[PDB]
Amino acid sequence: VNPCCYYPCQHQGICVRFGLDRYQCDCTRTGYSGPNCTIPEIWTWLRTTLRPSPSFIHFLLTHGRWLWDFVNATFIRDTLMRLVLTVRSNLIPSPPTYNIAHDYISWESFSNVSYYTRILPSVPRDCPTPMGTKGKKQLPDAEFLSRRFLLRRKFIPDPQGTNLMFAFFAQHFTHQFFKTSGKMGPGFTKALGHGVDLGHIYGDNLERQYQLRLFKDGKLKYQMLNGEVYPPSVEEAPVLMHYPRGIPPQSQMAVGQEVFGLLPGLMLYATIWLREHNRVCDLLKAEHPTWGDEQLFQTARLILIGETIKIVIEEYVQQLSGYFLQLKFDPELLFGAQFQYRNRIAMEFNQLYHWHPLMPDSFRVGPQDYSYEQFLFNTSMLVDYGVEALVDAFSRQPAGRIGGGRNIDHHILHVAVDVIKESRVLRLQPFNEYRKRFGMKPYTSFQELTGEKEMAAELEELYGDIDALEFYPGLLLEKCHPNSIFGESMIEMGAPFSLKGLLGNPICSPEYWKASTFGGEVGFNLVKTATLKKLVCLNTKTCPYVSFHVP
Amino acid sequence: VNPCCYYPCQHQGICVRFGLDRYQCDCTRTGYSGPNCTIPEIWTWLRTTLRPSPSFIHFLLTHGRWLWDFVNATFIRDTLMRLVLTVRSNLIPSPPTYNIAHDYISWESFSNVSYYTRILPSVPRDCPTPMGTKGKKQLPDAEFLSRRFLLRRKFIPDPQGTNLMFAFFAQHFTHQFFKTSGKMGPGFTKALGHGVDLGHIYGDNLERQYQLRLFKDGKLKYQMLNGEVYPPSVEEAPVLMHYPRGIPPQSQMAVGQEVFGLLPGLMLYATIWLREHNRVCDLLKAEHPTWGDEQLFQTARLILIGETIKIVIEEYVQQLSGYFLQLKFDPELLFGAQFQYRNRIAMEFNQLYHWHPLMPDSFRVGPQDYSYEQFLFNTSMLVDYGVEALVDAFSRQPAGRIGGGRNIDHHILHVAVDVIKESRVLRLQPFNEYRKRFGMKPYTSFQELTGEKEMAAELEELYGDIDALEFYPGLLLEKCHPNSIFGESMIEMGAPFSLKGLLGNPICSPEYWKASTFGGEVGFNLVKTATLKKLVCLNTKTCPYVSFHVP
Ligand code: HEM
Ligand code: HEM
Ligand SMILES: CCCCCCCCO[C@@H]1O[C@H](CO)[C@@H](O)[C@H](O)[C@H]1O
Ligand SMILES: CCCCCCCCO[C@@H]1O[C@H](CO)[C@@H](O)[C@H](O)[C@H]1O
Ligand SMILES: CCCCCCCCO[C@@H]1O[C@H](CO)[C@@H](O)[C@H](O)[C@H]1O
Ligand SMILES: C[C@H](C(=O)O)c1ccc(-c2ccccc2)c(F)c1
Ligand SMILES: C[C@H](C(=O)O)c1ccc(-c2ccccc2)c(F)c1
């Protein structure tokens, strides 16, 4: 049997097949040596035994407000943010390594941007079991697994107070770098760009971008409805949008991300961001009357990218982490560090981000309560209520807890079923292997994974061995931190991907992070002081309750 | 008038148009301050006043063999190589900045790989003169300029002893990353990859690659002639090649770079490298009997990329530079430094690499002397003589001196004429501006540029002002270093572009530079010990005189 099926190499060592039945582990720079990269070097040992557990650190970060309030007002804040940024980032290979086609470094994997990368190589196709060596010959039925442990019975709100304003932002934001190609199959993406390029606003290709642009003042095409600004119709912006057959072009809104017409929440943000882009163009023109359409457009896009990163780190991730430490977006924090300003979306990151539990049982907008059937392909709700109204409603309605299990609404449970199926097609390694790859000890049992006994027992019977537990199911069923939105794994694995994706952007490099890049001091400050509240309120007639936290 | 036409901002400061007639310079991180970034900071001043001139350093590097021999044997070698690598590299912006369409940072310039980047923004289209502010309203006729100062009269051999083996390597090597698109126009390239990706061997696109591959043992297709291995014919490898109409497919060789069938010298290297690829596949299969075609192919490609970089730095640049310092290819030399492992080909780099003066009056192969008309599209010479014979001939024939002027054979003078024309289309800034951008003082007169009076006087009459002298003409007409192949500019401007292109390759990154990346210790050593002699001789029946230096 293939010796690499036993995942012999530890601590990022690379398993290579040699001869007919042998294997060797390349422990280069792993900090370890030995046949399996398990014998540590002195420093590797100190470091690993002095490192407190993720749970302990989480505790420190979510307690002692008074002490943190002091720390947040000093340079210690920066010192810690830089620490967070570098330690989380180093866990992500850069340049990227493997893809669905190559379980080894190759020029094709490096240059071929249509591929999602992957942190761990796949489970060799010739292993005795689907997960490698452990588990049963056949994995649990995806549907059953989903109905049994992910289906929502009673809506469980997020203890951290996360609202739908956050949920939809999450969806909107991620769908700019998660666009799995149906034509090329899993493992492939149309979101070339691999990060925060705002392609869900400008399009993932030039032609579409040009069709969305006004080519006047660097602005984006738009239309007026009830005296408000909204994305233009597909009639005025002949772009491909995924709308149900039967919906005429003049009733479709053209935005950048083909799938956004499928949710008011999504089109809401599409509208907000579009309004903001045109707004920045105005400010820019005031500063540079000699500039043409291109430069105004390009420069505005850069400002919005900056705004997006700012809001995501300081407000989105802040809300999501619940830390008392004040997260900070300051590219300069890495100017003295070794860091590659590039990023490549990993398939695991795609899986991990399927936060469908966040969606509610229904959508409350004022006195009205809308059902999934009234909400999903609604082409009028956004215009009927307008931006302010929806922002207020979404900011007030709690979102469901992500981890813990049994919390995905039946209307969208099919997505989880497909994520599990894709996982197997992608031949993703077992959850415990990913635990190790991200610095955690593997779970020794299901009862340790879940903080209980009922589900644990059933999972053990189904999977047969904790070492067979799959990636996504593991993330969603892992016991949550005290009163947190999800378990440690989601953070320990999710943070590295996110932070590398945010800071890995070229505008965060010494070369780009200059006032001139954003049209001058005025443009630079729009980035440096971006805010969710300002994003909405500087573009709406009135200012509603806007936040990622429920009131 | 546009204030940026005066190139007011110094030391890489960025000129930005403000209001109707104003401008501001963004001096961020330039080491200077002031309206024009001319007021040096304390360290900036020390460094600039303690830095000896390029000529002085050149002198040190080309004298005192005894001392250098001692140094080359110590760690000082590594120390100096690190220095050269980082100081030269820091002069190249990474991520890249501008392109033919944008004279400012933009997401499109960053993501759009079909564009060549540029170090200096173009001469604003609305400047009083073509070069900005200096010179005449009309630039000198390209043809005349070429016939007057670049046309070869009497063949001037390279004093450093460079041969045609080197000359053909240079052409072969560069055409993998210099592939200007005719359909898209100047400023656009088909060599996505922007570096040493060996696309001239494997193709610049998958389809072409696939057509060139055997899909067995990871090898490339090939054919046998006179018992020797050669690239296959277009009949077996249906791939687009630029051969003159009238030549049958059976006489066309398929290699990777469409234009290589136009010179025995080029096809020679195409054959050598192809033989080497298949050779490495053999060694790999011996090591990994379980490997499939893909991995064998991919891994062999990585090894060849490494071999190419090793040889280019330790033998190619060594010969070219004339330095007594033993250059060294070692990715680890940068592991402690801040360095972006990415590269983007600059249009200026393309211009500067037009080394046509290297070509001779005719091509001597043994007793026979071949004219340009007998050499250029010869489809039989390579097979008639075979690899060993041509390598020996090309290694023995001296190549022409690059700098100095009046040394380009009339047969190819038209290329220079076009380079000058493209320069104007690309609106490249004046030579002196590039001098500054690369750390040199601008020439105060033509007589200072050339080391003489006659041509100087005529150039002054034609251009009117030293500040109007164009990029390429400046590189070729600048007085050469003592007994060197070219002037300081060629080195001070080209070295940064070159070294960055070599070390800024993903295989030189901590993540890729591992034995596992190249199939193990055996594959790694092929890179670490690559040599021009071995490249040829481990793939030929007999071993001829092989070198970049004439005997
Ligand atoms: C109205 C509620 C939602 C619905 C109806 C919905 C529906 C879907 C559907 C149909 C798919 C593709 C399924 C397939 O191809 O089998 C999908 C993918 C996805 N969804 Fe949702 N979703 C919702 C909310 C969310 C939220 C709140 C997030 C959190 C950021 C999210 C994140 C994702 C991700 C990351 C993907 C995969 C992206 C890709 O591979 O292209 N979804 N969703
Ligand atoms: C048999 C001798 C040679 C001939 C006939 C030749 C011919 C040409 C021609 C016809 C072009 C394109 C001209 C145009 O589009 O107007 C060209 C481009 C070029 N040549 Fe040569 N060349 C020769 C030797 C060399 C050598 C020794 C080098 C040194 C590395 C070199 C470097 C280049 C470069 C860098 C380009 C531009 C690449 C691009 O933009 O695609 N050439 N040459
Ligand atoms: C003073 C420093 C002492 C360092 C000793 C560290 C002991 C690490 O011990 C290692 O543990 C691994 C996992 O159990 C084993 O696989 C290795 O073979 C073993 O050497
Ligand atoms: C109170 C000081 C807080 C400093 C923030 C540390 C940054 C978080 O660091 C994280 O710690 C985890 C647990 O050890 C590791 O598993 C992660 O890989 C690491 O990135
Ligand atoms: C005697 C030791 C020599 C070490 C080689 C130094 C590396 C070359 O360094 C170069 O020197 C030039 C001259 O000032 C500068 O103009 C270039 O910008 C710089 O990169
Ligand atoms: C700052 C903090 C950390 O590094 O611990 C952090 C950073 C990013 C995330 C995060 C995890 C998953 C998706 C999106 C964001 C997270 F949950 C926590
Ligand atoms: C090592 C040395 C240096 O940095 O001075 C060096 C490095 C690269 C070049 C070089 C210049 C133009 C084309 C190709 C190579 C060169 F001419 C000299």
Curated annotation (Swiss-Prot), chains A, B:
EC code: 1.14.99.1
Main localization of the protein described in the UniProt heading: endoplasmic reticulum
GO biological process: cyclooxygenase pathway; prostaglandin biosynthetic process; regulation of blood pressure; response to oxidative stress
UniProt entry tagged with the keyword Cytoplasm: no
Organism placement in taxonomy: Eukaryota, Metazoa, Chordata, Craniata, Vertebrata
Disulfide bonds: 4-15, 5-127, 9-25, 27-37, 537-543
Membrane protein topology class: Multi-pass membrane protein
Essential cofactor(s): heme b
Pathway membership, UniProt: Lipid metabolism; prostaglandin biosynthesis
Site features described as Aspirin-acetylated serine, chain residue numbers: 498
Catalytic activity: (5Z,8Z,11Z,14Z)-eicosatetraenoate + AH2 + 2 O2 = prostaglandin H2 + A + H2O; (5Z,8Z,11Z,14Z)-eicosatetraenoate + 2 O2 = prostaglandin G2; prostaglandin G2 + AH2 = prostaglandin H2 + A + H2O; (9Z,12Z)-octadecadienoate + AH2 + O2 = (9R)-hydroxy-(10E,12Z)-octadecadienoate + A + H2O
All residue ranges annotated as the EGF-like domain in the record: 1-38
GO molecular function: heme binding; metal ion binding; oxidoreductase activity, acting on single donors with incorporation of molecular oxygen, incorporation of two atoms of oxygen; peroxidase activity; prostaglandin-endoperoxide synthase activity; protein homodimerization activity
Subcellular localization, as worded in the UniProt entry: Endoplasmic reticulum membrane; Microsome membrane
The name this protein goes by in its record: Prostaglandin G/H synthase 1
Effect of residue 353 to F: Abolishes cyclooxygenase activity
Cofactor comment: Binds 1 heme b (iron(II)-protoporphyrin IX) group per subunit.
Family: Belongs to the prostaglandin G/H synthase family.
Residues the record marks as site: Not glycosylated: 72
Keyword ATP-binding: no
